[PDB]
Protein backbone atom coordinates (compact mmCIF):
# COMPACT_ATOMS: atom_id res chain seq x y z
CA UNK A 1 0.00 0.00 0.00
CA UNK A 2 1.27 3.54 -0.96
CA UNK A 3 1.30 5.50 2.39
CA UNK A 4 -0.08 9.12 2.23
CA UNK A 5 0.99 12.35 4.10
CA UNK A 6 -2.57 12.74 5.47
CA UNK A 7 -4.52 13.22 8.77
CA UNK A 8 -7.55 10.94 9.35
CA UNK A 9 -9.95 13.58 10.68
CA UNK A 10 -13.12 12.08 12.21
CA UNK A 11 -16.87 12.85 12.78
CA UNK A 12 -20.20 10.88 13.09
CA UNK A 13 -23.37 11.95 11.04
CA UNK A 14 -24.67 15.52 11.83
CA UNK A 15 -21.83 17.55 13.56
CA UNK A 16 -19.49 20.65 13.47
CA UNK A 17 -15.71 20.18 12.64
CA UNK A 18 -13.01 22.76 11.58
CA UNK A 19 -10.23 22.17 8.91
CA UNK A 20 -7.27 23.91 10.60
CA UNK A 21 -3.53 24.08 9.65
CA UNK A 22 -0.38 24.07 12.07
CA UNK A 23 1.34 27.16 13.60
CA UNK A 24 4.06 27.43 10.83
CA UNK A 25 6.29 30.60 10.78
CA UNK A 26 5.41 33.76 8.69
CA UNK A 27 8.00 36.35 7.42
CA UNK A 28 6.22 39.12 5.30
CA UNK A 29 2.82 38.65 3.46
CA UNK A 30 0.35 35.66 3.79
CA UNK A 31 -3.31 35.82 2.43
CA UNK A 32 -4.93 32.80 0.56
CA UNK A 33 -6.12 29.52 2.22
CA UNK A 34 -7.50 26.91 -0.29
CA UNK A 35 -9.22 23.56 0.50
CA UNK A 36 -9.46 21.38 -2.69
CA UNK A 37 -10.12 17.59 -3.54
CA UNK A 38 -7.54 14.68 -3.90
CA UNK A 39 -9.50 12.13 -6.15
CA UNK A 40 -10.90 14.85 -8.60
CA UNK A 41 -8.06 17.54 -8.18
CA UNK A 42 -10.73 20.29 -7.73
CA UNK A 43 -10.83 23.66 -5.83
CA UNK A 44 -14.29 23.33 -4.10
CA UNK A 45 -13.78 26.44 -1.84
CA UNK A 46 -10.81 28.93 -1.67
CA UNK A 47 -10.03 32.34 -0.07
CA UNK A 48 -7.92 35.42 -1.00
CA UNK A 49 -8.42 39.28 -0.93
CA UNK A 50 -11.86 40.25 -2.49
CA UNK A 51 -10.64 38.65 -5.85
CA UNK A 52 -11.87 35.15 -6.80
CA UNK A 53 -13.42 33.90 -3.46
CA UNK A 54 -15.21 30.49 -3.77
CA UNK A 55 -17.21 29.95 -0.48
CA UNK A 56 -20.72 28.31 -1.15
CA UNK A 57 -23.10 27.31 1.79
CA UNK A 58 -22.36 27.11 5.62
CA UNK A 59 -21.89 23.24 5.53
CA UNK A 60 -18.44 23.84 3.80
CA UNK A 61 -17.24 27.50 4.23
CA UNK A 62 -13.56 28.56 4.73
CA UNK A 63 -12.57 31.23 7.41
CA UNK A 64 -10.60 34.39 6.35
CA UNK A 65 -7.57 34.41 8.83
CA UNK A 66 -6.88 30.74 7.86
CA UNK A 67 -9.41 28.05 8.96
CA UNK A 68 -12.52 26.12 7.75
CA UNK A 69 -16.00 25.52 9.34
CA UNK A 70 -18.08 22.42 8.34
CA UNK A 71 -21.45 23.45 10.01
CA UNK A 72 -23.76 20.32 10.06
CA UNK A 73 -22.27 17.20 8.35
CA UNK A 74 -23.49 13.71 7.29
CA UNK A 75 -21.95 11.14 4.80
CA UNK A 76 -23.03 13.30 1.74
CA UNK A 77 -21.80 16.63 3.41
CA UNK A 78 -18.09 15.33 3.60
CA UNK A 79 -15.00 14.62 1.33
CA UNK A 80 -11.20 13.86 1.20
CA UNK A 81 -9.10 17.18 1.16
CA UNK A 82 -5.65 18.70 0.43
CA UNK A 83 -4.78 22.26 1.72
CA UNK A 84 -2.60 24.71 -0.30
CA UNK A 85 -1.64 28.18 1.12
CA UNK A 86 -0.53 31.12 -1.14
CA UNK A 87 0.78 34.66 -0.22
CA UNK A 88 -0.54 38.27 -0.91
CA UNK A 89 1.53 37.92 -4.20
CA UNK A 90 0.40 34.20 -4.73
CA UNK A 91 3.42 31.88 -3.98
CA UNK A 92 2.82 28.29 -2.70
CA UNK A 93 4.07 28.00 0.97
CA UNK A 94 2.32 25.35 3.20
CA UNK A 95 0.85 22.26 1.33
CA UNK A 96 -0.43 19.09 3.20
CA UNK A 97 -2.96 16.18 2.64
CA UNK A 98 -6.19 15.64 4.81
CA UNK A 99 -9.43 13.44 5.04
CA UNK A 100 -12.96 14.18 6.57
CA UNK A 101 -14.10 10.57 7.48
CA UNK A 102 -17.34 9.19 9.15
CA UNK A 103 -17.33 7.11 12.43
CA UNK A 104 -18.75 3.51 12.47
CA UNK A 105 -19.17 2.61 16.17
mmCIF file of N, CA, C and O in Angstrom:
data_model
loop_
_atom_site.group_PDB
_atom_site.id
_atom_site.type_symbol
_atom_site.label_atom_id
_atom_site.label_comp_id
_atom_site.label_asym_id
_atom_site.label_seq_id
_atom_site.Cartn_x
_atom_site.Cartn_y
_atom_site.Cartn_z
ATOM 1 N N UNK A 1 0.846 -1.214 0.000
ATOM 2 C CA UNK A 1 0.000 0.000 0.000
ATOM 3 C C UNK A 1 0.887 1.273 0.000
ATOM 4 O O UNK A 1 1.795 1.410 0.829
ATOM 5 N N UNK A 2 0.588 2.220 -0.910
ATOM 6 C CA UNK A 2 1.274 3.542 -0.959
ATOM 7 C C UNK A 2 0.760 4.464 0.185
ATOM 8 O O UNK A 2 -0.436 4.766 0.267
ATOM 9 N N UNK A 3 1.673 4.854 1.095
ATOM 10 C CA UNK A 3 1.304 5.502 2.387
ATOM 11 C C UNK A 3 1.315 7.047 2.161
ATOM 12 O O UNK A 3 2.329 7.636 1.772
ATOM 13 N N UNK A 4 0.164 7.676 2.443
ATOM 14 C CA UNK A 4 -0.080 9.125 2.229
ATOM 15 C C UNK A 4 0.607 9.999 3.332
ATOM 16 O O UNK A 4 1.077 9.513 4.367
ATOM 17 N N UNK A 5 0.616 11.317 3.082
ATOM 18 C CA UNK A 5 0.988 12.346 4.102
ATOM 19 C C UNK A 5 -0.265 13.112 4.615
ATOM 20 O O UNK A 5 -0.378 14.340 4.540
ATOM 21 N N UNK A 6 -1.189 12.307 5.149
ATOM 22 C CA UNK A 6 -2.570 12.743 5.471
ATOM 23 C C UNK A 6 -2.962 12.515 6.952
ATOM 24 O O UNK A 6 -2.484 11.587 7.614
ATOM 25 N N UNK A 7 -3.885 13.372 7.434
ATOM 26 C CA UNK A 7 -4.519 13.218 8.766
ATOM 27 C C UNK A 7 -5.941 12.653 8.551
ATOM 28 O O UNK A 7 -6.793 13.257 7.888
ATOM 29 N N UNK A 8 -6.177 11.503 9.191
ATOM 30 C CA UNK A 8 -7.546 10.936 9.353
ATOM 31 C C UNK A 8 -8.295 11.739 10.453
ATOM 32 O O UNK A 8 -7.875 11.814 11.612
ATOM 33 N N UNK A 9 -9.369 12.396 10.008
ATOM 34 C CA UNK A 9 -9.949 13.585 10.683
ATOM 35 C C UNK A 9 -11.474 13.296 10.792
ATOM 36 O O UNK A 9 -12.204 13.308 9.799
ATOM 37 N N UNK A 10 -11.925 12.949 12.008
ATOM 38 C CA UNK A 10 -13.120 12.077 12.214
ATOM 39 C C UNK A 10 -14.390 12.846 12.673
ATOM 40 O O UNK A 10 -14.294 13.828 13.416
ATOM 41 N N UNK A 11 -15.575 12.328 12.288
ATOM 42 C CA UNK A 11 -16.867 12.852 12.783
ATOM 43 C C UNK A 11 -18.081 11.998 12.372
ATOM 44 O O UNK A 11 -18.310 11.791 11.181
ATOM 45 N N UNK A 12 -18.908 11.582 13.349
ATOM 46 C CA UNK A 12 -20.199 10.877 13.088
ATOM 47 C C UNK A 12 -21.286 11.779 12.424
ATOM 48 O O UNK A 12 -21.160 13.007 12.445
ATOM 49 N N UNK A 13 -22.360 11.182 11.844
ATOM 50 C CA UNK A 13 -23.372 11.945 11.042
ATOM 51 C C UNK A 13 -24.015 13.131 11.840
ATOM 52 O O UNK A 13 -24.476 12.953 12.973
ATOM 53 N N UNK A 14 -24.040 14.325 11.226
ATOM 54 C CA UNK A 14 -24.673 15.523 11.830
ATOM 55 C C UNK A 14 -23.845 16.234 12.912
ATOM 56 O O UNK A 14 -24.289 16.263 14.063
ATOM 57 N N UNK A 15 -22.674 16.814 12.558
ATOM 58 C CA UNK A 15 -21.834 17.547 13.561
ATOM 59 C C UNK A 15 -20.926 18.664 12.953
ATOM 60 O O UNK A 15 -20.664 18.721 11.749
ATOM 61 N N UNK A 16 -20.435 19.557 13.837
ATOM 62 C CA UNK A 16 -19.495 20.649 13.469
ATOM 63 C C UNK A 16 -18.014 20.188 13.657
ATOM 64 O O UNK A 16 -17.629 19.758 14.749
ATOM 65 N N UNK A 17 -17.202 20.357 12.598
ATOM 66 C CA UNK A 17 -15.711 20.179 12.642
ATOM 67 C C UNK A 17 -15.051 21.355 11.855
ATOM 68 O O UNK A 17 -15.574 21.823 10.842
ATOM 69 N N UNK A 18 -13.852 21.775 12.305
ATOM 70 C CA UNK A 18 -13.010 22.764 11.575
ATOM 71 C C UNK A 18 -11.856 22.052 10.806
ATOM 72 O O UNK A 18 -11.282 21.074 11.298
ATOM 73 N N UNK A 19 -11.481 22.590 9.622
ATOM 74 C CA UNK A 19 -10.227 22.168 8.909
ATOM 75 C C UNK A 19 -9.162 23.278 9.103
ATOM 76 O O UNK A 19 -9.289 24.397 8.602
ATOM 77 N N UNK A 20 -8.137 22.933 9.897
ATOM 78 C CA UNK A 20 -7.269 23.912 10.596
ATOM 79 C C UNK A 20 -5.790 23.439 10.511
ATOM 80 O O UNK A 20 -5.424 22.333 10.925
ATOM 81 N N UNK A 21 -4.962 24.330 9.960
ATOM 82 C CA UNK A 21 -3.528 24.075 9.647
ATOM 83 C C UNK A 21 -2.577 24.329 10.874
ATOM 84 O O UNK A 21 -2.955 25.110 11.758
ATOM 85 N N UNK A 22 -1.329 23.767 10.960
ATOM 86 C CA UNK A 22 -0.379 24.067 12.068
ATOM 87 C C UNK A 22 0.128 25.536 12.134
ATOM 88 O O UNK A 22 -0.092 26.352 11.232
ATOM 89 N N UNK A 23 0.813 25.843 13.251
ATOM 90 C CA UNK A 23 1.339 27.164 13.601
ATOM 91 C C UNK A 23 2.716 27.521 12.953
ATOM 92 O O UNK A 23 3.579 28.157 13.567
ATOM 93 N N UNK A 24 2.869 27.132 11.675
ATOM 94 C CA UNK A 24 4.057 27.426 10.825
ATOM 95 C C UNK A 24 4.419 28.948 10.756
ATOM 96 O O UNK A 24 3.543 29.817 10.703
ATOM 97 N N UNK A 25 5.733 29.225 10.755
ATOM 98 C CA UNK A 25 6.290 30.604 10.780
ATOM 99 C C UNK A 25 5.958 31.467 9.524
ATOM 100 O O UNK A 25 5.922 30.962 8.396
ATOM 101 N N UNK A 26 5.733 32.771 9.758
ATOM 102 C CA UNK A 26 5.412 33.758 8.693
ATOM 103 C C UNK A 26 6.438 34.926 8.729
ATOM 104 O O UNK A 26 6.673 35.536 9.779
ATOM 105 N N UNK A 27 7.029 35.242 7.560
ATOM 106 C CA UNK A 27 8.003 36.355 7.415
ATOM 107 C C UNK A 27 7.288 37.689 7.052
ATOM 108 O O UNK A 27 7.230 38.580 7.906
ATOM 109 N N UNK A 28 6.784 37.846 5.808
ATOM 110 C CA UNK A 28 6.218 39.121 5.305
ATOM 111 C C UNK A 28 5.252 38.714 4.158
ATOM 112 O O UNK A 28 5.691 38.385 3.050
ATOM 113 N N UNK A 29 3.940 38.760 4.452
ATOM 114 C CA UNK A 29 2.823 38.648 3.460
ATOM 115 C C UNK A 29 2.307 37.185 3.355
ATOM 116 O O UNK A 29 2.966 36.329 2.762
ATOM 117 N N UNK A 30 1.102 36.944 3.914
ATOM 118 C CA UNK A 30 0.355 35.657 3.793
ATOM 119 C C UNK A 30 -1.171 35.990 3.710
ATOM 120 O O UNK A 30 -1.690 36.751 4.536
ATOM 121 N N UNK A 31 -1.896 35.434 2.709
ATOM 122 C CA UNK A 31 -3.313 35.822 2.428
ATOM 123 C C UNK A 31 -4.284 34.634 2.136
ATOM 124 O O UNK A 31 -5.331 34.537 2.783
ATOM 125 N N UNK A 32 -3.985 33.804 1.120
ATOM 126 C CA UNK A 32 -4.928 32.798 0.559
ATOM 127 C C UNK A 32 -4.847 31.461 1.334
ATOM 128 O O UNK A 32 -3.756 30.977 1.654
ATOM 129 N N UNK A 33 -6.026 30.870 1.596
ATOM 130 C CA UNK A 33 -6.124 29.519 2.222
ATOM 131 C C UNK A 33 -7.175 28.749 1.363
ATOM 132 O O UNK A 33 -8.372 29.054 1.391
ATOM 133 N N UNK A 34 -6.685 27.739 0.626
ATOM 134 C CA UNK A 34 -7.499 26.905 -0.295
ATOM 135 C C UNK A 34 -7.659 25.481 0.279
ATOM 136 O O UNK A 34 -6.699 24.867 0.747
ATOM 137 N N UNK A 35 -8.892 24.963 0.171
ATOM 138 C CA UNK A 35 -9.223 23.556 0.496
ATOM 139 C C UNK A 35 -9.926 22.966 -0.775
ATOM 140 O O UNK A 35 -11.026 23.371 -1.201
ATOM 141 N N UNK A 36 -9.175 22.021 -1.370
ATOM 142 C CA UNK A 36 -9.457 21.376 -2.686
ATOM 143 C C UNK A 36 -9.561 19.818 -2.544
ATOM 144 O O UNK A 36 -9.318 19.276 -1.462
ATOM 145 N N UNK A 37 -9.926 19.078 -3.620
ATOM 146 C CA UNK A 37 -10.121 17.594 -3.539
ATOM 147 C C UNK A 37 -8.844 16.809 -3.968
ATOM 148 O O UNK A 37 -8.069 17.290 -4.803
ATOM 149 N N UNK A 38 -8.646 15.580 -3.436
ATOM 150 C CA UNK A 38 -7.538 14.675 -3.896
ATOM 151 C C UNK A 38 -7.929 13.804 -5.132
ATOM 152 O O UNK A 38 -7.219 13.845 -6.140
ATOM 153 N N UNK A 39 -9.030 13.023 -5.049
ATOM 154 C CA UNK A 39 -9.500 12.133 -6.152
ATOM 155 C C UNK A 39 -9.890 12.849 -7.485
ATOM 156 O O UNK A 39 -9.513 12.366 -8.556
ATOM 157 N N UNK A 40 -10.614 13.983 -7.416
ATOM 158 C CA UNK A 40 -10.903 14.846 -8.599
ATOM 159 C C UNK A 40 -9.766 15.856 -8.976
ATOM 160 O O UNK A 40 -9.659 16.201 -10.156
ATOM 161 N N UNK A 41 -8.976 16.375 -8.000
ATOM 162 C CA UNK A 41 -8.057 17.543 -8.178
ATOM 163 C C UNK A 41 -8.868 18.837 -8.483
ATOM 164 O O UNK A 41 -8.882 19.309 -9.625
ATOM 165 N N UNK A 42 -9.610 19.350 -7.474
ATOM 166 C CA UNK A 42 -10.731 20.286 -7.729
ATOM 167 C C UNK A 42 -10.908 21.263 -6.549
ATOM 168 O O UNK A 42 -11.314 20.859 -5.458
ATOM 169 N N UNK A 43 -10.659 22.561 -6.815
ATOM 170 C CA UNK A 43 -10.833 23.662 -5.832
ATOM 171 C C UNK A 43 -12.331 23.957 -5.539
ATOM 172 O O UNK A 43 -12.963 24.800 -6.183
ATOM 173 N N UNK A 44 -12.873 23.221 -4.544
ATOM 174 C CA UNK A 44 -14.290 23.325 -4.103
ATOM 175 C C UNK A 44 -14.578 24.641 -3.320
ATOM 176 O O UNK A 44 -15.562 25.305 -3.665
ATOM 177 N N UNK A 45 -13.747 25.047 -2.330
ATOM 178 C CA UNK A 45 -13.775 26.444 -1.838
ATOM 179 C C UNK A 45 -12.318 26.949 -1.667
ATOM 180 O O UNK A 45 -11.369 26.180 -1.476
ATOM 181 N N UNK A 46 -12.140 28.274 -1.775
ATOM 182 C CA UNK A 46 -10.812 28.927 -1.666
ATOM 183 C C UNK A 46 -10.978 30.431 -1.342
ATOM 184 O O UNK A 46 -11.934 31.093 -1.756
ATOM 185 N N UNK A 47 -9.997 30.958 -0.602
ATOM 186 C CA UNK A 47 -10.029 32.344 -0.067
ATOM 187 C C UNK A 47 -8.826 33.147 -0.572
ATOM 188 O O UNK A 47 -7.732 32.595 -0.657
ATOM 189 N N UNK A 48 -9.033 34.455 -0.832
ATOM 190 C CA UNK A 48 -7.916 35.416 -1.002
ATOM 191 C C UNK A 48 -8.385 36.818 -0.495
ATOM 192 O O UNK A 48 -8.628 36.964 0.707
ATOM 193 N N UNK A 49 -8.442 37.853 -1.362
ATOM 194 C CA UNK A 49 -8.415 39.281 -0.932
ATOM 195 C C UNK A 49 -9.462 40.110 -1.734
ATOM 196 O O UNK A 49 -9.111 41.014 -2.501
ATOM 197 N N UNK A 50 -10.763 39.772 -1.585
ATOM 198 C CA UNK A 50 -11.860 40.253 -2.490
ATOM 199 C C UNK A 50 -11.611 40.067 -4.035
ATOM 200 O O UNK A 50 -11.975 40.927 -4.845
ATOM 201 N N UNK A 51 -10.987 38.939 -4.433
ATOM 202 C CA UNK A 51 -10.644 38.645 -5.845
ATOM 203 C C UNK A 51 -10.533 37.117 -5.983
ATOM 204 O O UNK A 51 -9.630 36.455 -5.460
ATOM 205 N N UNK A 52 -11.551 36.608 -6.680
ATOM 206 C CA UNK A 52 -11.868 35.154 -6.802
ATOM 207 C C UNK A 52 -11.977 34.448 -5.413
ATOM 208 O O UNK A 52 -10.992 33.892 -4.916
ATOM 209 N N UNK A 53 -13.164 34.519 -4.786
ATOM 210 C CA UNK A 53 -13.415 33.896 -3.459
ATOM 211 C C UNK A 53 -14.582 32.896 -3.661
ATOM 212 O O UNK A 53 -15.755 33.283 -3.720
ATOM 213 N N UNK A 54 -14.228 31.602 -3.736
ATOM 214 C CA UNK A 54 -15.212 30.489 -3.767
ATOM 215 C C UNK A 54 -15.512 30.096 -2.291
ATOM 216 O O UNK A 54 -14.593 29.880 -1.495
ATOM 217 N N UNK A 55 -16.795 30.071 -1.911
ATOM 218 C CA UNK A 55 -17.209 29.947 -0.480
ATOM 219 C C UNK A 55 -18.540 29.182 -0.227
ATOM 220 O O UNK A 55 -18.658 28.559 0.832
ATOM 221 N N UNK A 56 -19.510 29.192 -1.173
ATOM 222 C CA UNK A 56 -20.715 28.313 -1.151
ATOM 223 C C UNK A 56 -21.610 28.444 0.132
ATOM 224 O O UNK A 56 -21.755 29.548 0.669
ATOM 225 N N UNK A 57 -22.219 27.340 0.596
ATOM 226 C CA UNK A 57 -23.105 27.315 1.793
ATOM 227 C C UNK A 57 -22.312 27.076 3.117
ATOM 228 O O UNK A 57 -21.150 26.656 3.096
ATOM 229 N N UNK A 58 -22.976 27.300 4.266
ATOM 230 C CA UNK A 58 -22.358 27.107 5.622
ATOM 231 C C UNK A 58 -21.809 25.697 5.989
ATOM 232 O O UNK A 58 -20.840 25.597 6.750
ATOM 233 N N UNK A 59 -22.413 24.635 5.429
ATOM 234 C CA UNK A 59 -21.893 23.237 5.527
ATOM 235 C C UNK A 59 -20.436 22.986 5.017
ATOM 236 O O UNK A 59 -19.828 22.004 5.447
ATOM 237 N N UNK A 60 -19.885 23.836 4.124
ATOM 238 C CA UNK A 60 -18.440 23.840 3.799
ATOM 239 C C UNK A 60 -18.075 25.299 3.417
ATOM 240 O O UNK A 60 -18.355 25.749 2.300
ATOM 241 N N UNK A 61 -17.486 26.039 4.375
ATOM 242 C CA UNK A 61 -17.239 27.501 4.234
ATOM 243 C C UNK A 61 -15.945 27.883 4.990
ATOM 244 O O UNK A 61 -15.831 27.650 6.197
ATOM 245 N N UNK A 62 -14.974 28.473 4.260
ATOM 246 C CA UNK A 62 -13.564 28.557 4.731
ATOM 247 C C UNK A 62 -13.306 29.934 5.408
ATOM 248 O O UNK A 62 -13.561 30.977 4.807
ATOM 249 N N UNK A 63 -12.835 29.964 6.674
ATOM 250 C CA UNK A 63 -12.572 31.230 7.413
ATOM 251 C C UNK A 63 -11.419 32.084 6.799
ATOM 252 O O UNK A 63 -10.488 31.559 6.173
ATOM 253 N N UNK A 64 -11.509 33.411 7.002
ATOM 254 C CA UNK A 64 -10.603 34.392 6.350
ATOM 255 C C UNK A 64 -9.142 34.423 6.880
ATOM 256 O O UNK A 64 -8.224 34.342 6.059
ATOM 257 N N UNK A 65 -8.911 34.504 8.211
ATOM 258 C CA UNK A 65 -7.571 34.412 8.830
ATOM 259 C C UNK A 65 -6.749 33.150 8.417
ATOM 260 O O UNK A 65 -5.557 33.255 8.110
ATOM 261 N N UNK A 66 -7.429 31.992 8.410
ATOM 262 C CA UNK A 66 -6.877 30.740 7.863
ATOM 263 C C UNK A 66 -7.444 29.542 8.619
ATOM 264 O O UNK A 66 -6.771 28.999 9.496
ATOM 265 N N UNK A 67 -8.688 29.158 8.286
ATOM 266 C CA UNK A 67 -9.414 28.050 8.963
ATOM 267 C C UNK A 67 -10.521 27.579 7.959
ATOM 268 O O UNK A 67 -10.669 28.055 6.827
ATOM 269 N N UNK A 68 -11.283 26.574 8.392
ATOM 270 C CA UNK A 68 -12.524 26.119 7.748
ATOM 271 C C UNK A 68 -13.584 25.795 8.826
ATOM 272 O O UNK A 68 -13.234 25.383 9.933
ATOM 273 N N UNK A 69 -14.875 25.957 8.478
ATOM 274 C CA UNK A 69 -16.003 25.524 9.342
ATOM 275 C C UNK A 69 -16.994 24.686 8.480
ATOM 276 O O UNK A 69 -17.646 25.174 7.549
ATOM 277 N N UNK A 70 -17.085 23.398 8.854
ATOM 278 C CA UNK A 70 -18.080 22.422 8.338
ATOM 279 C C UNK A 70 -19.242 22.536 9.362
ATOM 280 O O UNK A 70 -19.092 22.038 10.480
ATOM 281 N N UNK A 71 -20.356 23.213 9.030
ATOM 282 C CA UNK A 71 -21.453 23.451 10.013
ATOM 283 C C UNK A 71 -22.637 22.531 9.627
ATOM 284 O O UNK A 71 -23.351 22.804 8.657
ATOM 285 N N UNK A 72 -22.812 21.429 10.384
ATOM 286 C CA UNK A 72 -23.758 20.321 10.059
ATOM 287 C C UNK A 72 -23.168 19.438 8.926
ATOM 288 O O UNK A 72 -23.169 19.838 7.757
ATOM 289 N N UNK A 73 -22.689 18.238 9.291
ATOM 290 C CA UNK A 73 -22.270 17.197 8.348
ATOM 291 C C UNK A 73 -23.319 16.043 8.312
ATOM 292 O O UNK A 73 -24.472 16.153 8.721
ATOM 293 N N UNK A 74 -22.868 15.030 7.603
ATOM 294 C CA UNK A 74 -23.490 13.710 7.292
ATOM 295 C C UNK A 74 -22.418 13.018 6.364
ATOM 296 O O UNK A 74 -21.341 13.547 6.047
ATOM 297 N N UNK A 75 -22.741 11.820 5.847
ATOM 298 C CA UNK A 75 -21.955 11.136 4.798
ATOM 299 C C UNK A 75 -21.864 11.872 3.423
ATOM 300 O O UNK A 75 -20.790 11.920 2.820
ATOM 301 N N UNK A 76 -22.985 12.440 2.959
ATOM 302 C CA UNK A 76 -23.028 13.302 1.739
ATOM 303 C C UNK A 76 -22.512 14.771 1.897
ATOM 304 O O UNK A 76 -22.079 15.357 0.899
ATOM 305 N N UNK A 77 -22.512 15.346 3.114
ATOM 306 C CA UNK A 77 -21.804 16.625 3.413
ATOM 307 C C UNK A 77 -20.243 16.562 3.338
ATOM 308 O O UNK A 77 -19.648 17.631 3.158
ATOM 309 N N UNK A 78 -19.577 15.384 3.472
ATOM 310 C CA UNK A 78 -18.086 15.328 3.598
ATOM 311 C C UNK A 78 -17.292 14.950 2.307
ATOM 312 O O UNK A 78 -17.866 14.566 1.284
ATOM 313 N N UNK A 79 -15.944 15.060 2.396
ATOM 314 C CA UNK A 79 -15.004 14.616 1.329
ATOM 315 C C UNK A 79 -13.554 14.384 1.888
ATOM 316 O O UNK A 79 -13.212 14.774 3.008
ATOM 317 N N UNK A 80 -12.678 13.831 1.023
ATOM 318 C CA UNK A 80 -11.197 13.859 1.199
ATOM 319 C C UNK A 80 -10.662 15.266 0.735
ATOM 320 O O UNK A 80 -11.122 15.807 -0.279
ATOM 321 N N UNK A 81 -9.677 15.836 1.469
ATOM 322 C CA UNK A 81 -9.100 17.183 1.157
ATOM 323 C C UNK A 81 -7.553 17.174 0.954
ATOM 324 O O UNK A 81 -6.833 16.261 1.358
ATOM 325 N N UNK A 82 -7.062 18.262 0.333
ATOM 326 C CA UNK A 82 -5.651 18.703 0.433
ATOM 327 C C UNK A 82 -5.697 20.251 0.565
ATOM 328 O O UNK A 82 -6.275 20.940 -0.279
ATOM 329 N N UNK A 83 -5.022 20.792 1.598
ATOM 330 C CA UNK A 83 -4.777 22.256 1.722
ATOM 331 C C UNK A 83 -3.598 22.722 0.813
ATOM 332 O O UNK A 83 -2.584 22.025 0.667
ATOM 333 N N UNK A 84 -3.738 23.946 0.274
ATOM 334 C CA UNK A 84 -2.602 24.707 -0.300
ATOM 335 C C UNK A 84 -2.769 26.196 0.093
ATOM 336 O O UNK A 84 -3.845 26.788 -0.026
ATOM 337 N N UNK A 85 -1.667 26.789 0.560
ATOM 338 C CA UNK A 85 -1.644 28.177 1.116
ATOM 339 C C UNK A 85 -0.715 29.012 0.192
ATOM 340 O O UNK A 85 0.393 28.602 -0.156
ATOM 341 N N UNK A 86 -1.211 30.198 -0.191
ATOM 342 C CA UNK A 86 -0.530 31.121 -1.141
ATOM 343 C C UNK A 86 -0.481 32.533 -0.485
ATOM 344 O O UNK A 86 -1.287 32.884 0.384
ATOM 345 N N UNK A 87 0.507 33.352 -0.879
ATOM 346 C CA UNK A 87 0.785 34.660 -0.216
ATOM 347 C C UNK A 87 -0.184 35.800 -0.685
ATOM 348 O O UNK A 87 -1.108 35.565 -1.475
ATOM 349 N N UNK A 88 0.034 37.057 -0.226
ATOM 350 C CA UNK A 88 -0.537 38.267 -0.910
ATOM 351 C C UNK A 88 -0.143 38.433 -2.417
ATOM 352 O O UNK A 88 -0.993 38.822 -3.220
ATOM 353 N N UNK A 89 1.119 38.123 -2.783
ATOM 354 C CA UNK A 89 1.527 37.925 -4.200
ATOM 355 C C UNK A 89 0.984 36.615 -4.865
ATOM 356 O O UNK A 89 0.736 36.648 -6.076
ATOM 357 N N UNK A 90 0.816 35.487 -4.134
ATOM 358 C CA UNK A 90 0.402 34.198 -4.727
ATOM 359 C C UNK A 90 1.609 33.280 -4.998
ATOM 360 O O UNK A 90 1.964 33.058 -6.157
ATOM 361 N N UNK A 91 2.224 32.769 -3.915
ATOM 362 C CA UNK A 91 3.417 31.884 -3.984
ATOM 363 C C UNK A 91 3.207 30.742 -2.960
ATOM 364 O O UNK A 91 2.936 30.988 -1.777
ATOM 365 N N UNK A 92 3.346 29.485 -3.425
ATOM 366 C CA UNK A 92 2.821 28.289 -2.702
ATOM 367 C C UNK A 92 3.778 27.988 -1.506
ATOM 368 O O UNK A 92 4.950 27.652 -1.711
ATOM 369 N N UNK A 93 3.264 28.127 -0.276
ATOM 370 C CA UNK A 93 4.065 28.004 0.969
ATOM 371 C C UNK A 93 3.737 26.616 1.593
ATOM 372 O O UNK A 93 4.434 25.634 1.317
ATOM 373 N N UNK A 94 2.673 26.549 2.403
ATOM 374 C CA UNK A 94 2.319 25.345 3.203
ATOM 375 C C UNK A 94 1.292 24.478 2.413
ATOM 376 O O UNK A 94 0.186 24.932 2.106
ATOM 377 N N UNK A 95 1.693 23.234 2.087
ATOM 378 C CA UNK A 95 0.848 22.260 1.335
ATOM 379 C C UNK A 95 0.880 20.894 2.084
ATOM 380 O O UNK A 95 1.949 20.423 2.492
ATOM 381 N N UNK A 96 -0.297 20.267 2.298
ATOM 382 C CA UNK A 96 -0.431 19.089 3.203
ATOM 383 C C UNK A 96 -1.784 18.373 2.916
ATOM 384 O O UNK A 96 -2.804 19.011 2.638
ATOM 385 N N UNK A 97 -1.786 17.032 3.011
ATOM 386 C CA UNK A 97 -2.960 16.179 2.642
ATOM 387 C C UNK A 97 -3.837 15.924 3.929
ATOM 388 O O UNK A 97 -3.364 16.009 5.068
ATOM 389 N N UNK A 98 -5.149 15.698 3.731
ATOM 390 C CA UNK A 98 -6.188 15.645 4.815
ATOM 391 C C UNK A 98 -7.379 14.715 4.407
ATOM 392 O O UNK A 98 -7.483 14.309 3.243
ATOM 393 N N UNK A 99 -8.297 14.364 5.348
ATOM 394 C CA UNK A 99 -9.427 13.437 5.041
ATOM 395 C C UNK A 99 -10.583 13.682 6.050
ATOM 396 O O UNK A 99 -10.467 13.177 7.173
ATOM 397 N N UNK A 100 -11.746 14.314 5.699
ATOM 398 C CA UNK A 100 -12.956 14.179 6.568
ATOM 399 C C UNK A 100 -13.565 12.754 6.368
ATOM 400 O O UNK A 100 -13.991 12.403 5.264
ATOM 401 N N UNK A 101 -13.568 11.958 7.452
ATOM 402 C CA UNK A 101 -14.101 10.566 7.478
ATOM 403 C C UNK A 101 -15.271 10.434 8.499
ATOM 404 O O UNK A 101 -15.403 11.231 9.433
ATOM 405 N N UNK A 102 -16.118 9.399 8.315
ATOM 406 C CA UNK A 102 -17.343 9.185 9.146
ATOM 407 C C UNK A 102 -17.123 7.956 10.078
ATOM 408 O O UNK A 102 -16.775 6.859 9.627
ATOM 409 N N UNK A 103 -17.398 8.164 11.382
ATOM 410 C CA UNK A 103 -17.328 7.111 12.430
ATOM 411 C C UNK A 103 -18.362 5.962 12.215
ATOM 412 O O UNK A 103 -19.496 6.180 11.771
ATOM 413 N N UNK A 104 -17.921 4.741 12.554
ATOM 414 C CA UNK A 104 -18.747 3.510 12.466
ATOM 415 C C UNK A 104 -18.505 2.721 13.777
ATOM 416 O O UNK A 104 -17.588 1.903 13.896
ATOM 417 N N UNK A 105 -19.344 3.059 14.767
ATOM 418 C CA UNK A 105 -19.174 2.613 16.171
ATOM 419 C C UNK A 105 -20.577 2.275 16.719
ATOM 420 O O UNK A 105 -21.355 3.197 17.061
#
